[PDB]
Amino acid sequence: ASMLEAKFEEASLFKRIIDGFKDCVQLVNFQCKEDGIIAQAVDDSRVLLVSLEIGVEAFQEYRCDHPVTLGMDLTSLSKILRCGNNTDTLTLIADNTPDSIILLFEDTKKDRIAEYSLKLMDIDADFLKIEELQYDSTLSLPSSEFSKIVRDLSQLSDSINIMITKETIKFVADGDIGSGSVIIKPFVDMEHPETSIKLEMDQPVDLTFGAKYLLDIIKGSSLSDRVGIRLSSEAPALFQFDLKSGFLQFFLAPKFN
Amino acid sequence: ASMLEAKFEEASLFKRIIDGFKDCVQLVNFQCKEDGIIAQAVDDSRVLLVSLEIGVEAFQEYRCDHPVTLGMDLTSLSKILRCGNNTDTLTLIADNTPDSIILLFEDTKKDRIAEYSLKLMDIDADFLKIEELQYDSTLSLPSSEFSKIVRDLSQLSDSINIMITKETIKFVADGDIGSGSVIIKPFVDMEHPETSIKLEMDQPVDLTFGAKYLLDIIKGSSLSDRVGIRLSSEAPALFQFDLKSGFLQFFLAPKFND
Amino acid sequence: TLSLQLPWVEKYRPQVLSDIVGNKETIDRLQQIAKDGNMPHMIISGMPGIGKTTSVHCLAHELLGRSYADGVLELNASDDRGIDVVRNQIKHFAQKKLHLPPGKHKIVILDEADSMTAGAQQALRRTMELYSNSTRFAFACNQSNKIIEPLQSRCAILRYSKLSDEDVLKRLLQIIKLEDVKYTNDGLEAIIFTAEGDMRQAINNLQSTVAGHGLVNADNVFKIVDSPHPLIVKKMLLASNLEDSIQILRTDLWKKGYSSIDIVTTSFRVTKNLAQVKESVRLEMIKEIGLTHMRILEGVGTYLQLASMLAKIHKLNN
Amino acid sequence: KRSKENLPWVEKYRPETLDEVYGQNEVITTVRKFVDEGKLPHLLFYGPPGTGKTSTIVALAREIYGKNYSNMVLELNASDDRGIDVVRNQIKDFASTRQIFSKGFKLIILDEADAMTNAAQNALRRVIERYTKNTRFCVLANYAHKLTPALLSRCTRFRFQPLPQEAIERRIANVLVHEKLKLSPNAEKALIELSNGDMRRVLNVLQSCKATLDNPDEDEISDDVIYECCGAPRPSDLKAVLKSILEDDWGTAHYTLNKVRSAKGLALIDLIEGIVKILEDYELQNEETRVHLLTKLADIEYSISKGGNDQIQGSAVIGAIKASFENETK
Amino acid sequence: VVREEDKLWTVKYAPTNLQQVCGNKGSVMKLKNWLANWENSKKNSFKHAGKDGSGVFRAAMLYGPPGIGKTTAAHLVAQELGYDILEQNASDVRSKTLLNAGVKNALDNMSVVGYFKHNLNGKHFVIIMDEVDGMSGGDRGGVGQLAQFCRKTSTPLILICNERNLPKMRPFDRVCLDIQFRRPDANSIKSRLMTIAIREKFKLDPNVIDRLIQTTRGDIRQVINLLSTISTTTKTINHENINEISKAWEKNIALKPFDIAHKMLDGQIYSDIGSRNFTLNDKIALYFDDFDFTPLMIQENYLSTRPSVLKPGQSHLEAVAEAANCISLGDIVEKKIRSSEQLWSLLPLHAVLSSVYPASKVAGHMAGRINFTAWLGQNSKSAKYYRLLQEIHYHTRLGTSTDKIGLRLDYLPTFRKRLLDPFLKQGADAISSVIEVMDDYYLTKEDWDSIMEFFVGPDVTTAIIKKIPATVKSGFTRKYNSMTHPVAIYRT
DNA sequence: TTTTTTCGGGGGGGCCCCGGGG
DNA sequence: CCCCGGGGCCCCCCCGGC
Ligand SMILES: Nc1ncnc2c1ncn2[C@@H]1O[C@H](COP(=O)(O)OP(=O)(O)OP(O)(O)=S)[C@@H](O)[C@H]1O
Ligand SMILES: Nc1ncnc2c1ncn2[C@@H]1O[C@H](COP(=O)(O)OP(=O)(O)OP(O)(O)=S)[C@@H](O)[C@H]1O
Ligand SMILES: Nc1ncnc2c1ncn2[C@@H]1O[C@H](COP(=O)(O)OP(=O)(O)OP(O)(O)=S)[C@@H](O)[C@H]1O
Ligand SMILES: [Mg+2]
Ligand SMILES: [Mg+2]
Ligand SMILES: [Mg+2]
């Protein structure tokens, strides 16, 4: 219990992060460096990529002697994380060349400790380098609105088409039983700055996406109040949820023209 | 409606009592006599023994002329009890040489009567004396914390090991995905004497129990705010929940250490 | 009495490969694998009570040393081995990270694998192929045919044969010397003859005889272990005169409490394995036995039906 | 369930201790020796109906555990569900856990195990092997061909013979003493003959005979009472029918058979069975006679089992016997 | 990190290039050509078949025996053309719901990993559904979904199985380009076996390689496994241990129906020495290899042999009659087995009555080619015609007094003379009258057509109906469709 | 060189809906 | 007052001897 020691002030934060994307990917590699934790995963269909960054400022304490990698099955990690109370400090502990990690739940008001050991998995995956790309359209909208739109349009068709044009965002879910259309107009309210719908628009874009991947993405709405969507002509759409110190990004490949 | 007439002022108490151990046993013999009702049952696997006692202080009125044995299937009894509102008094009625038990739900304010009959069953079970044993360790803790610990540990393994040592109680589970260990210590708070953990130890103990049986047992937490666990090597573990007048007890055999 | 004496089949279960009698070539190969390492996927098939489970467990123990608890996953018929289990638990065990000595791998022991469903066996194929660099699979079964061909292709087949009377005698003498058992040559010969190459049966019979009578002689052994009824049936079917066959049926089988269904089934099996008689004659006798078996299954399980079957067989053999 | 006197004699006279089991001295002595010195192995009891297997195992359980045996053993039979899931959960839990009441070993009794599926039997193998240190299994069976070889390899076998004559006589004497009944020697001989080694048949027939008496206190049960209540042919009837068949013409034999059957409403199957038993002792010069007798009588029995015309079947019996015995001349 | 000495040889010497795979060169080339022209076919909507004819199939189906190299070949062809592979196997859940959720959304979706990695085809998916034979289930098993996707997909699809001649694979009858992988020849594998033996430092005789390849029945993986296990201790594979090695590693393979029929009907095994070598237990086991089809094959092929086991004075016809009698007895036993009593304990007896005994009575040399059982198709045809007869009978119930069998045997021949003959004789003028009859018995045009097929022998209506002028049939159809008709079973 | 009947058991996929948490 | 986890049925698919 010397190499890696990462103390979350509240165990709920890590559980929320895991729940954000545990239903899209199953086996994830978390690399802990001297700056923080980075995780990259690809779903079974190789269509959706999940990126997670947690900075050093997101921990009550953080100490990593040497860079380490930990392969975890998110199901078991969530199973363990459900055993912690809301008002408990969490500690991830690892040693050199670890076969397992230690999750320690500590309570200060009560002298009770809960130590769990999670067996690590051997995962052989290639780290894809996600270079920055100047997207055509940028959008920022409250997470609740996007989640409601996606859940409403999902039951109509297996696919949802987003058309961003001058001062307009259109979601269409034409299917078999019927069709659906929702039009969002950018607007800003000073009384409630957390409700404004911001759109920076350069080139018109019309992209079609699978509904199941949007349904998986919207599960991250808890982490961030406002979700950002960056869209290009053909490059994968980037759905980002911010975190106190870090972010959770979803890269979704559009359906071919 | 002559021999046995026992009125629960609240019909929900009997429903809760039955629900506390309906998932453990199915066929149960209720012995009703002048000083109240008793019941003892053994699980089909014969690993768990359930013992219920209800005194006459738990009834608004209670009358039993001679001892009467009623063999019931707990599934049917739970079905019947689910048909009663929380604001109705519940009268249990039985006659001489009974082939049935009558459950009568009364709502005087609404003047609503709901009478149900449940056919009795012939169960050849003799009440086995649960001889008192001087246990090595005896502890008491809030039922909610024990339920949470059991539920958390059941996710890892099918067996949970309890170790009682000087000033320490440890629950350990080891499984395919990993392991877990929860350690508690006796703590007393005069401000709120319901979250306290009490322990009295004579000899340290270490016993392993099936997780499914503990999951079944913790369902009695809805009856009492505290649970008393008595453990002793070479003897079944006793889990007791105390009612207003009586109690519900679970005797669970430990797993063979081999 | 609430005490129990540990059975000798458990008290004297071999703990190393050197203590396993019979199948010298296979045990030597297992010993070489254990000494060297790089265990391949293997399937071990044989008849009951010859040392398959013992061999697999000894190999795993000697290969993995102190890492046995962490690097061995044992599943048998008494456990759940459905498609979900294969797809989740076995896969997780295969993917588990566990540092091991330079030439060791995790071992999955699927005992009595012949009872596994086709779907689970199909699911095992890619799990075996993908994680062969850290996990190896050992199957133990009684019927190798039940293992699907794709799995057999990926495994090394190590078939076990019945133990010879010499190996059984050696093991029995070792156990007798350890336990200080009074015995006579005829008693051991009877034990070996009744065991029929099943070491577990021989050891159990010896222990039962010692407990019941102490002295292990022919009389006590036969008092404990009954004469195999298949041999009585074989004598009945090969009798020269119909009167002798009927006498055997009435005295050695019918009056001993053997059911008609058991007698007819044993007759069918013995006639099937009666190489001494011509195949066509055996086929005719099998036809008659099948007629009688159908009649018994319809509910007429009387001694008259068996007598008629014997008479028809005698007519055929004339 | 008022009193023990409202029970059928088969259940009212069930042995309670090993000392009351008759006709199985070898097995009883061996199992008692095993229990006394704490050397009980896994047991298999193979035998025909009504020989004392269930009674013996229950008495052994009482001997080991005492009056409260029912809560210390796991008894499963054909009337219960014994699938693979049951073996995996209930039997496994019972075998791997300590006794609640005492500190002794644990007994599992799988009565009528021949009715268990192959999958459950296979699942039981490692359960038996793994928990031998603290658990023992007892299997009971009437048909060994339904038991897998793996299960047979793990058990020590005891065969329950058909009850000898002497055990039946002693049990009958006990029942007569308890019931205040009188049985004539010939009546006892006939009862033992018709029992075929099954105690349940003896008890049921004796109860029926008692119910058949006008005044059981003084009236005695004779062979006539036994034959009347069971509706079975008398030895004299069988001898007369066989003599008529073997020594008279077709008309006389047919008339004699019809008259004998109609006198007491006898069944043709009983006559055929009795005549087969009688003929089994005949010393026949030619084997063809016996072959034809056996084959034709078996065919007639099989035909009767499915119904048919009774008169034609009786004539067939007469003709078959006559034709078969025609071969004895040369 | 993993030492190369701790790897299985099947992994160490896996083919890393398409030219390193031994055998089935033609099938590999066919698959390469089909996958390389997938875009060209797409531009033509998969309508213009090419030179090889692989232009109308949007999905390939590779099948063959185990261990030939189907998976490696498919993977290598996928990588060489630059595509991205989306592979699934029996280790994953592939039911109706899971298939409609995961793979359905990838048949027309860009590969995010392909986008980030970057050829013009690296952003597309080549779905490889391996071990389709293991997809247990019917409509919900996902096999039907994969068959449907083979008809609709925007990217190449590859399906790999072992036994394509399986009922569960029927939905894939004509949906994919079939590609056969066959037992590779000994010469192709000999080079790799020699190379492996040289690298592993053990003695391998070149001649022994042929026997080893014969033992494994063209299973290269099993050959390498056997080589490893033998070289473990015995490093000298000489000619003094060929028999022991071959007999120790002889895979127990269940014979196929044609092979079972050929072996059971061979007269050699029924001779004294042949019976001593191939015992009765062996014949019963051969029956048990496939107990559902063996009796059918024996019944089909027991009249097409030249016997070599005839008794002195017995002719072929008498042996055939005895075999037929025993086949009838076996059929009765089979009826007993598949009843409410479920008397499966009689299965061995059936083996003797249905297959072994009749085969032994006519065993010899095949006088032709083993034919598949014709009883199944005949039974299906009989069921179809019985359903049609039931429909016709319950349409005419209100007018007739008979059962369905009586309708077939008595009524229909007379119905023909009032329904078909007037058209043949009068022509168009016979229209109305016919309809009149059709109205009196609630007959529909479909009922007319169905009735016109029951007749056999000299009264077959196929050619006769086909010869009627088209104008008469058109007039009949128009007149029937231009009028209201009564209905018998007016379900509500 | 292709493709069937019945109980009972077992397995495995699919919902359904109560309960409990937020 | 509304959403999510997980027990319980419901439905369908395949075996069956030594
Ligand atoms: N070759 C052997 N050498 C010594 N003891 C043996 C041998 N074979 C069997 N035994 C003994 O019999 C007991 C059972 O042996 P097992 O290994 O369980 O046989 P098995 O092949 O696994 O039987 P099945 O196929 O599971 S019914 C062992 O504990 C040993 O005590
Ligand atoms: N040895 C016996 N001694 C005295 N009574 C016996 C004996 N055997 C059978 N009986 C009587 O017959 C009744 C039934 O005996 P059981 O022990 O049930 O025979 P069983 O062999 O277990 O029958 P099966 O195998 O289930 S058909 C007993 O209650 C006794 O009344
Ligand atoms: N044509 C081949 N050439 C060289 N090695 C082969 C060949 N086929 C099989 N092998 C060897 O056996 C191993 C497995 O080959 P596979 O590609 O899995 O064959 P397969 O036909 O797909 O087996 P199935 O159908 O999944 S049982 C390879 O890694 C090779 O080591
Ligand atoms: Mg074994
Ligand atoms: Mg019994
Ligand atoms: Mg493959």
Side-chain angles (χ1 to χ4, degrees), chain D residues 46-321:
Chain D
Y46 169 76
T51 38
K53 295 187 298 305
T54 290
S55 301
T56 299
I57 184 46
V58 175
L60 202 66
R62 282 197 202 90
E63 183 80 302
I64 294 157
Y65 299 104
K67 278 201 178 177
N68 302 359
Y69 85 90
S70 323
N71 294 121
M72 308 185 67
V73 309
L74 177 62
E75 193 187 311
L76 300 168
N77 52 48
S79 88
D80 310 332
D81 207 76
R82 297 181 302 184
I84 191 166
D85 217 64
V86 169
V87 175
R88 286 200 289 254
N89 291 297
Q90 179 179 7
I91 298 175
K92 213 170 182 173
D93 292 351
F94 181 82
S96 74
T97 311
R98 312 185 83 81
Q99 294 269 17
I100 302 167
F101 303 86
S102 92
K103 320 298 161 189
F105 67 90
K106 314 207 70 202
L107 185 64
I108 307 188
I109 300 160
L110 300 173
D111 201 353
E112 300 150 356
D114 44 0
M116 279 180 77
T117 67
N118 287 298
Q121 291 185 44
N122 281 335
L124 272 170
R125 293 151 69 179
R126 291 256 69 199
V127 182
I128 291 152
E129 287 197 289
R130 158 169 217 191
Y131 302 115
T132 42
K133 182 177 177 337
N134 293 123
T135 316
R136 290 280 172 280
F137 283 69
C138 191
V139 189
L140 284 72
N142 297 117
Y143 320 109
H145 83 96
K146 296 281 263 287
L147 301 181
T148 59
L151 183 53
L152 292 168
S153 179
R154 289 158 168 81
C155 295
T156 289
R157 175 177 172 276
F158 288 86
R159 195 186 85 267
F160 278 67
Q161 68 185 356
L163 282 160
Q165 181 180 324
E166 313 59 71
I168 295 168
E169 315 197 41
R170 290 184 302 98
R171 187 46 145 171
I172 286 165
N174 264 125
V175 168
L176 291 174
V177 166
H178 181 271
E179 296 290 342
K180 322 218 270 287
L181 263 173
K182 295 191 216 133
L183 190 68
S184 60
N186 283 107
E188 197 183 317
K189 268 166 117 283
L191 186 57
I192 293 155
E193 161 271 326
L194 68 87
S195 85
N196 279 107
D198 186 353
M199 199 73 89
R200 272 196 281 252
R201 194 82 227 272
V202 179
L203 291 174
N204 284 318
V205 170
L206 209 61
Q207 194 187 335
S208 283
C209 284
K210 191 189 179 185
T212 301
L213 296 172
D214 302 341
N215 220 336
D217 302 0
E218 53 275 82
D219 302 6
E220 175 159 9
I221 305 174
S222 53
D223 46 5
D224 273 352
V225 181
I226 304 265
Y227 296 129
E228 152 79 2
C229 103
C230 307
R234 306 175 96 280
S236 76
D237 298 341
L238 295 157
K239 253 102 172 63
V241 170
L242 186 50
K243 180 199 227 59
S244 196
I245 287 168
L246 283 176
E247 309 185 2
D248 307 353
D249 83 295
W250 256 92
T252 285
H254 175 78
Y255 159 96
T256 297
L257 177 54
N258 285 248
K259 148 158 154 273
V260 166
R261 289 189 67 203
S262 85
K264 300 247 85 180
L266 301 171
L268 182 61
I269 187 66
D270 316 333
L271 276 155
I272 287 163
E273 160 257 299
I275 272 151
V276 164
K277 274 183 190 83
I278 295 165
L279 287 174
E280 268 272 278
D281 292 39
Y282 274 46
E283 197 145 318
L284 311 171
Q285 301 143 219
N286 189 358
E287 227 175 55
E288 271 300 323
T289 304
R290 181 131 275 142
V291 166
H292 289 291
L293 281 164
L294 292 170
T295 51
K296 297 182 92 63
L297 292 175
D299 280 323
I300 292 164
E301 203 198 62
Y302 176 68
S303 174
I304 285 161
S305 85
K306 306 159 86 162
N309 186 324
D310 217 64
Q311 303 258 90
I312 289 162
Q313 294 156 342
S315 273
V317 166
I318 293 179
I321 289 165

Side-chain angles (χ1 to χ4, degrees), chain C residues 1 5 10 78-79 142 198 200-201 208 212 226 242 256 258 262 295 298 300 302-303 305 314, chain D residues 33 36 38 46 92 105 125-126 129 136 144-145 153 156-157 159 280 287 290 298-299 301-302:
Chain C
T1 287
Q5 163 185 99
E10 286 306 352
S78 88
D79 315 307
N142 286 118
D198 183 350
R200 183 204 280 109
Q201 261 288 107
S208 289
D226 264 348
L242 174 66
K256 262 67 190 296
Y258 286 97
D262 290 326
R295 276 197 195 172
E298 259 161 308
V300 194
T302 67
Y303 154 87
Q305 300 297 327
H314 179 88
Chain D
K33 191 178 212 300
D36 297 338
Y46 169 76
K92 213 170 182 173
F105 67 90
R125 293 151 69 179
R126 291 256 69 199
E129 287 197 289
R136 290 280 172 280
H145 83 96
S153 179
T156 289
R157 175 177 172 276
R159 195 186 85 267
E280 268 272 278
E287 227 175 55
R290 181 131 275 142
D299 280 323
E301 203 198 62
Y302 176 68

Side-chain angles (χ1 to χ4, degrees), chain A residues 215-226:
Chain A
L215 278 174
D216 299 333
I217 289 156
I218 55 163
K219 281 168 158 135
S221 285
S222 53
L223 301 165
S224 203
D225 228 331
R226 319 185 38 51

Side-chain angles (χ1 to χ4, degrees), chain E residues 65-117 119-361:
Chain E
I68 306 322
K70 297 174 300 313
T71 286
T72 179
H75 280 45
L76 291 180
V77 302
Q79 323 193 153
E80 272 186 358
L81 287 172
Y83 290 82
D84 191 44
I85 289 73
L86 169 55
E87 196 277 344
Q88 303 257 280
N89 34 67
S91 95
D92 326 306
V93 202
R94 298 186 288 184
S95 60
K96 190 119 208 203
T97 325
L98 282 295
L99 282 185
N100 292 327
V103 72
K104 184 209 264 296
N105 302 61
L107 305 191
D108 51 80
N109 204 320
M110 182 201 294
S111 177
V112 62
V113 52
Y115 182 92
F116 281 113
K117 286 271 193 70
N119 200 38
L120 303 186
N121 264 232
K123 261 138 60 171
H124 287 82
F125 278 138
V126 173
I127 290 76
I128 313 186
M129 310 293 294
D130 213 330
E131 295 145 323
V132 182
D133 51 307
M135 281 174 102
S136 65
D139 62 357
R140 92 199 209 195
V143 50
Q145 264 297 0
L146 270 172
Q148 184 169 331
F149 292 131
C150 290
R151 284 149 21 79
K152 334 174 180 192
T153 163
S154 308
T155 74
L157 174 58
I158 301 173
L159 266 58
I160 316 178
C161 95
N162 273 306
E163 303 183 5
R164 174 134 167 82
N165 294 9
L166 193 77
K168 301 193 177 178
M169 304 293 127
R170 284 178 135 167
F172 294 79
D173 279 339
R174 209 147 288 97
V175 299
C176 287
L177 178 81
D178 287 1
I179 313 202
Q180 218 67 331
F181 286 67
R182 287 168 209 89
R183 308 232 152 80
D185 53 297
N187 302 4
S188 287
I189 307 154
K190 262 160 184 193
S191 305
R192 289 202 70 82
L193 293 182
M194 221 59 243
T195 294
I196 270 65
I198 293 155
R199 303 222 207 187
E200 295 290 359
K201 318 300 180 194
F202 68 83
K203 307 303 186 181
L204 181 51
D205 313 344
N207 302 358
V208 168
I209 287 168
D210 207 340
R211 171 60 169 286
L212 293 169
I213 271 179
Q214 195 273 111
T215 325
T216 64
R217 305 217 47 210
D219 192 330
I220 293 151
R221 186 203 284 139
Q222 195 80 99
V223 170
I224 304 151
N225 290 337
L226 191 161
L227 253 49
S228 318
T229 308
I230 271 49
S231 179
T232 290
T233 313
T234 297
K235 300 189 172 176
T236 39
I237 313 187
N238 303 344
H239 303 256
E240 307 86 82
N241 50 21
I242 293 171
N243 271 16
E244 297 185 349
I245 296 169
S246 182
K247 297 155 184 184
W249 298 84
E250 181 74 352
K251 292 182 75 189
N252 53 326
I253 295 291
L255 256 78
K256 295 274 133 64
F258 286 82
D259 314 313
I260 293 167
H262 182 259
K263 174 148 201 74
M264 189 87 78
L265 285 176
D266 163 57
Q268 208 304 276
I269 66 174
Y270 297 101
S271 74
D272 296 357
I273 297 71
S275 312
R276 214 170 306 282
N277 278 68
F278 203 75
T279 64
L280 183 50
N281 304 74
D282 299 340
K283 270 162 268 215
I284 297 177
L286 179 67
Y287 162 88
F288 274 112
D289 276 21
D290 189 354
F291 76 79
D292 268 273
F293 280 87
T294 300
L296 290 174
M297 304 292 302
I298 296 299
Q299 198 270 331
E300 172 76 34
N301 294 281
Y302 86 104
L303 305 175
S304 59
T305 74
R306 284 201 290 300
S308 66
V309 301
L310 284 178
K311 322 167 164 93
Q314 190 187 35
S315 83
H316 189 12
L317 188 61
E318 321 194 80
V320 147
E322 278 152 41
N325 187 78
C326 208
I327 285 159
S328 284
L329 293 172
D331 169 62
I332 284 158
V333 176
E334 199 251 29
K335 171 129 165 300
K336 273 188 161 186
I337 293 167
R338 311 198 103 95
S339 81
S340 310
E341 268 284 347
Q342 310 292 342
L343 301 169
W344 293 94
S345 64
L346 296 161
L347 255 184
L349 170 63
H350 189 239
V352 172
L353 292 176
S354 75
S355 312
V356 178
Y357 183 102
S360 90
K361 292 295 190 84

